[PDB]
């Protein structure tokens, strides 16, 4: 049966964690950015190519080129549910007064999805979280 993947995220910028109810605030060398990926409906023990992208955002609209990208190879935990940490490290060249949002993609290394329904997987499982208006993935530099 085909896996039904879902991901949400929570960003931490410097010492400051965002949440469903408030974006993270960073006090005016670079900003340490860590994104937590909350996943369900992945395949236990399978490896995923995870790509995080940091964008400047203005009123829930992405502006300009990515400020940073980070990739990792992470393994799905028990029942294909759990949390991953994607550490971007220090991100240089962010601007005081500006807001940033994290986008995430995870693509399985193995074929985990039977897209043509012959009961044999032939497609990668791909999950995305690309919401420019998600305050839990957003931080502002004060
Ligand atoms: Ca197939
Ligand atoms: Na979230």
Query: What CA–CA distance (Å, rounded) separates 26 from 90?
Result: 13
Enumerate domains of the chain plus CATH numbers.
6-134 (2.60.40.3930)
Distance CA(55)–CA(11), nearest Å, equals 13
Structure-token match 């949390």, residue found? 83
Annotated binding residues, as ranges? 114, 116, 118, 120, 122
Question: How far does residue 20's CA lie from ligand 2's centre (Å)?
Answer: 5
Contacts of 110 (CB under 8 A, 6+ apart): 46, 47, 121, 124
Distance 33 CA to ligand 1 centre (A): 39
Query: Resolution, rounded to a tenth of an Å?
Result: 1.5
What gap in Å lies between CA 46 and CA 121, rounded to an integer? 14
Binding-site sequence positions for Ca(2+): 114, 116, 118, 120, 122
Instruction: Pull the structure tokens for residue 4.
Output: 């039904």
The residues that bridge with 74 in the sheet, in sequence order, are 48
Experimental method reported for this structure: X-ray
Distance CA 22, CA 34 (A): 16
SS3 assignment, position 122: coil
In the block, residue with structure tokens 């294909």: 80
**Phi and psi angles of residue 106, each rounded to the nearest 5 degrees, phi first:** -130, 130
Ligand nearest to the Cα of 117, by number: 1
């Amino acid at each position: 049966v085909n896996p039904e993947g879902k991901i949400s995220t929570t960003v931490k910028a410097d010492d400051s964690t965002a949440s469903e109810t408030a974006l993270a605030e960073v006090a005016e060398d670079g900003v340490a950015v860590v994104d937590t990926i909350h996943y369900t409906g992945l395949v236990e023990g399978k490896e995923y190519d995870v790509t995080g992208t940091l964008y400047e955002v203005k009123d829930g609209v992405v502006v300009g080129d990515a400020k940073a990208t980070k990739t990792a190879v992470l393994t799905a935990g028990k029942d294909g549910k759990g949390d991953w940490e994607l550490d971007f490290g220090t991100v240089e060249g962010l601007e005081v007064g500006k807001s940033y949002v994290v986008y995430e993609k995870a693509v399985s290394k193995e074929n985990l999805v039977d897209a043509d329904g012959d009961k044999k997987p032939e497609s990668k499982q791909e999950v995305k979280h690309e919401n420019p208006a998600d305050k839990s993935q957003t931080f502002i530099i004060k």
